[PDB]
Design a protein around this ligand. Structure first.
Ligand SMILES: [K+]
Ligand SMILES: [K+]
Ligand SMILES: [Mg+2]
Ligand SMILES: [Mg+2]
Ligand SMILES: [Mg+2]
Ligand SMILES: [Mg+2]
Length: 118
RNA sequence: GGCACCACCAGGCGUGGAGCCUGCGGCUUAAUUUGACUCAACACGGGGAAACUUACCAGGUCCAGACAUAGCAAGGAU
């Protein structure tokens, strides 16, 4: 009902557009004062990656959600083809999905917004 | 046996001779793009081309290769 189940709000955000995926863009999505959430994937090897993104998110004030399995981070962020119902997706691995603008369908967003508050 | 000035007769104006214009052949050319050769090809392609036309020659670009499949890929395909 929270955290993991809140991939749906980001489904709606991807539908309505607003997922600024990837670090190169993540940063830009931040400094452009348009970042709202910043799911991350601890699977990333390069420590400077996580240090730098946390530094940028600390510079502004938006949010940081951690989630494991960067492959699943690619899955949630649309970094894949829907394929069949079983979804044999050749998934691309993501490590930052800035929800610039954010899906405006609300719902779980409010609940994750609570987790966002804390 | 007929018919017809795209035949002749009686003629008129001509062309064929000259200069030039233009089309065709040939030659030359990097290419001198090419179709058409008795009437029924040859100022014909409505073709009087500076560029475009343009099909030719010498070069330079670009993809305006949908779609399907498989890969590469947000630590970036492009
Ligand atoms: K004459
Ligand atoms: K003629
Ligand atoms: Mg006569
Ligand atoms: Mg003459
Ligand atoms: Mg020309
Ligand atoms: Mg030319």
């Amino acid at each position: 009902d929270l955290m993991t189940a809140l991939q749906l709000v980001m489904k709606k955000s991807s539908a309505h557009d607003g997922l600024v995926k990837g670090l190169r863009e993540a940063a830009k999505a931040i400094e452009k004062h348009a970042a709202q959430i910043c799911v991350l994937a601890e699977d990333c090897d390069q420590p400077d990656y996580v240090k730098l993104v946390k530094a940028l998110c600390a510079e502004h004030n938006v949010h940081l959600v951690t989630v494991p399995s960067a492959k699943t981070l690619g899955e949630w962020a649309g970094l894949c083809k829907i394929d069949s119902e079983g979804k044999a997706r050749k998934v691309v691995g993501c490590s930052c999905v800035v929800v610039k603008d954010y899906g405006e369908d609300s719902e779980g967003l409010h609940i994750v917004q609570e987790y966002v508050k804390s």
